[PDB]
Coordinates of all heavy atoms in Angstrom, one line a residue:
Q1 N -47.7 -14.2 44.5 CA -47.7 -14.9 43.2 C -47.5 -16.4 43.3 O -46.6 -16.8 44.0 CB -46.7 -14.2 42.3 CG -46.9 -12.7 42.0 CD -48.1 -12.5 41.1 OE1 -49.0 -11.8 41.6 NE2 -48.1 -12.9 39.9
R2 N -48.3 -17.1 42.5 CA -48.2 -18.6 42.4 C -47.9 -19.1 41.0 O -48.1 -18.3 40.1 CB -49.5 -19.3 43.0 CG -49.6 -19.1 44.5 CD -51.0 -19.5 45.0 NE -51.2 -19.3 46.4 CZ -50.9 -20.2 47.3 NH1 -50.5 -21.4 46.9 NH2 -51.1 -20.0 48.6
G3 N -47.5 -20.3 40.9 CA -47.3 -20.9 39.6 C -45.9 -20.6 39.0 O -45.7 -20.9 37.8
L4 N -45.0 -20.1 39.8 CA -43.7 -19.7 39.3 C -42.6 -20.8 39.5 O -42.6 -21.5 40.5 CB -43.2 -18.4 40.1 CG -44.0 -17.1 39.9 CD1 -43.7 -16.2 41.0 CD2 -43.6 -16.5 38.5
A5 N -41.8 -20.9 38.4 CA -40.7 -21.9 38.4 C -39.5 -21.4 37.6 O -39.7 -20.5 36.8 CB -41.2 -23.2 37.7
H6 N -38.4 -22.0 37.8 CA -37.1 -21.7 37.1 C -37.1 -22.8 36.1 O -37.1 -24.0 36.5 CB -35.9 -21.7 38.0 CG -34.6 -21.6 37.3 ND1 -33.5 -22.3 37.8 CD2 -34.2 -20.8 36.3 CE1 -32.5 -22.0 37.0 NE2 -32.9 -21.1 36.0
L7 N -37.2 -22.5 34.7 CA -37.2 -23.5 33.7 C -35.9 -23.5 32.9 O -35.5 -22.5 32.4 CB -38.4 -23.3 32.7 CG -38.5 -24.3 31.5 CD1 -38.8 -25.7 31.9 CD2 -39.5 -23.7 30.4
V8 N -35.3 -24.7 32.8 CA -34.1 -24.9 32.1 C -34.3 -26.1 31.1 O -34.7 -27.2 31.5 CB -32.8 -25.2 33.0 CG1 -31.6 -25.6 32.2 CG2 -32.6 -23.9 33.9
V9 N -34.1 -25.8 29.8 CA -34.3 -26.8 28.7 C -32.9 -27.2 28.1 O -32.1 -26.2 27.8 CB -35.2 -26.3 27.6 CG1 -35.7 -27.5 26.7 CG2 -36.5 -25.6 28.2
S10 N -32.5 -28.4 28.0 CA -31.2 -28.8 27.5 C -31.2 -30.2 26.9 O -32.3 -30.8 26.6 CB -30.1 -28.7 28.6 OG -28.9 -28.4 27.9
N11 N -30.0 -30.8 26.7 CA -29.8 -32.1 26.1 C -30.5 -32.3 24.7 O -31.2 -33.3 24.5 CB -30.1 -33.3 27.0 CG -29.4 -34.6 26.8 OD1 -28.5 -34.7 25.9 ND2 -29.8 -35.6 27.5
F12 N -30.4 -31.3 23.8 CA -31.0 -31.3 22.6 C -30.3 -32.2 21.6 O -29.1 -32.1 21.4 CB -31.1 -29.9 22.0 CG -31.9 -28.9 22.8 CD1 -31.3 -27.9 23.5 CD2 -33.3 -28.9 22.7 CE1 -32.0 -27.0 24.3 CE2 -34.1 -27.9 23.4 CZ -33.4 -27.0 24.2
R13 N -31.1 -33.1 20.9 CA -30.5 -33.9 19.8 C -31.7 -34.4 19.0 O -32.9 -34.3 19.4 CB -29.6 -35.1 20.3 CG -30.3 -36.3 21.0 CD -30.6 -36.0 22.5 NE -30.9 -37.2 23.2 CZ -31.6 -37.2 24.3 NH1 -32.0 -36.1 24.9 NH2 -31.9 -38.4 24.9
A14 N -31.4 -34.9 17.7 CA -32.5 -35.3 16.9 C -32.0 -36.5 16.1 O -30.8 -36.6 15.9 CB -33.0 -34.2 16.0
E15 N -32.9 -37.4 15.6 CA -32.5 -38.6 14.9 C -33.3 -38.7 13.6 O -34.5 -38.5 13.6 CB -32.9 -39.8 15.8 CG -32.0 -40.0 17.0 CD -32.4 -41.2 17.9 OE1 -33.6 -41.5 17.9 OE2 -31.5 -41.8 18.5
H16 N -32.7 -39.3 12.6 CA -33.3 -39.6 11.3 C -34.1 -38.4 10.7 O -35.2 -38.7 10.1 CB -34.1 -40.9 11.4 CG -33.3 -42.1 11.8 ND1 -33.9 -43.0 12.6 CD2 -32.0 -42.4 11.5 CE1 -32.9 -43.9 12.8 NE2 -31.8 -43.6 12.1
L17 N -33.6 -37.2 10.8 CA -34.2 -36.1 10.2 C -34.1 -36.1 8.7 O -33.1 -36.7 8.2 CB -33.6 -34.8 10.7 CG -33.7 -34.4 12.2 CD1 -33.1 -33.0 12.4 CD2 -35.1 -34.5 12.7
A18 N -35.0 -35.4 8.0 CA -34.9 -35.4 6.5 C -35.3 -34.0 6.1 O -36.4 -33.6 6.0 CB -35.8 -36.4 5.8
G19 N -34.2 -33.2 5.8 CA -34.4 -31.7 5.6 C -34.1 -31.3 4.2 O -34.5 -30.1 3.8
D20 N -33.3 -32.1 3.4 CA -32.9 -31.7 2.0 C -33.2 -32.8 1.0 O -33.4 -34.0 1.4 CB -31.4 -31.3 1.9 CG -31.0 -30.0 2.6 OD1 -31.9 -29.1 2.8 OD2 -29.9 -29.8 3.0
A21 N -33.1 -32.5 -0.3 CA -33.4 -33.4 -1.3 C -32.2 -34.2 -1.7 O -32.3 -35.4 -2.2 CB -34.0 -32.7 -2.5
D22 N -31.0 -33.6 -1.6 CA -29.7 -34.2 -2.1 C -28.6 -34.4 -1.1 O -27.6 -35.0 -1.5 CB -29.2 -33.2 -3.2 CG -29.8 -33.4 -4.6 OD1 -29.8 -34.5 -5.1 OD2 -30.2 -32.4 -5.2
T23 N -28.8 -33.8 0.0 CA -27.7 -33.9 1.1 C -28.4 -34.2 2.4 O -29.7 -34.2 2.5 CB -26.9 -32.6 1.1 OG1 -27.7 -31.5 1.6 CG2 -26.2 -32.2 -0.2
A24 N -27.7 -34.3 3.5 CA -28.2 -34.5 4.8 C -28.8 -33.2 5.4 O -28.6 -32.1 4.8 CB -27.1 -35.0 5.7
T25 N -29.6 -33.3 6.4 CA -30.3 -32.2 7.1 C -29.2 -31.2 7.7 O -28.2 -31.7 8.2 CB -31.2 -32.8 8.2 OG1 -32.0 -33.8 7.6 CG2 -32.0 -31.7 8.9
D26 N -29.6 -30.0 7.7 CA -28.8 -28.9 8.3 C -29.6 -28.3 9.4 O -30.2 -27.2 9.2 CB -28.3 -27.9 7.3 CG -28.0 -28.5 6.0 OD1 -27.1 -29.4 6.0 OD2 -28.5 -28.2 4.9

Protein backbone atom coordinates (compact mmCIF):
# COMPACT_ATOMS: atom_id res chain seq x y z
CA GLN A 1 0.00 0.00 0.00
CA ARG A 2 1.17 3.54 -0.94
CA GLY A 3 0.00 7.09 -0.18
CA LEU A 4 -0.37 6.43 3.58
CA ALA A 5 0.26 9.09 6.24
CA HIS A 6 -0.50 9.86 9.88
CA LEU A 7 -2.51 13.16 9.75
CA VAL A 8 -2.78 15.49 12.78
CA VAL A 9 -4.76 18.81 12.54
CA SER A 10 -4.39 21.41 15.33
CA ASN A 11 -3.79 25.09 16.39
CA PHE A 12 -7.38 26.07 15.49
CA ARG A 13 -8.34 29.73 15.77
CA ALA A 14 -10.40 32.30 13.85
CA GLU A 15 -10.44 36.08 13.45
CA HIS A 16 -13.15 38.70 12.82
CA LEU A 17 -15.98 36.17 12.44
CA ALA A 18 -19.57 37.44 12.07
CA GLY A 19 -22.13 34.84 13.13
CA ASP A 20 -25.01 36.74 14.85
CA ALA A 21 -27.04 39.90 14.30
CA ASP A 22 -26.94 41.27 17.89
CA THR A 23 -24.08 39.55 19.72
CA ALA A 24 -20.61 38.14 18.97
CA THR A 25 -20.08 34.83 17.08
CA ASP A 26 -20.52 31.50 18.93
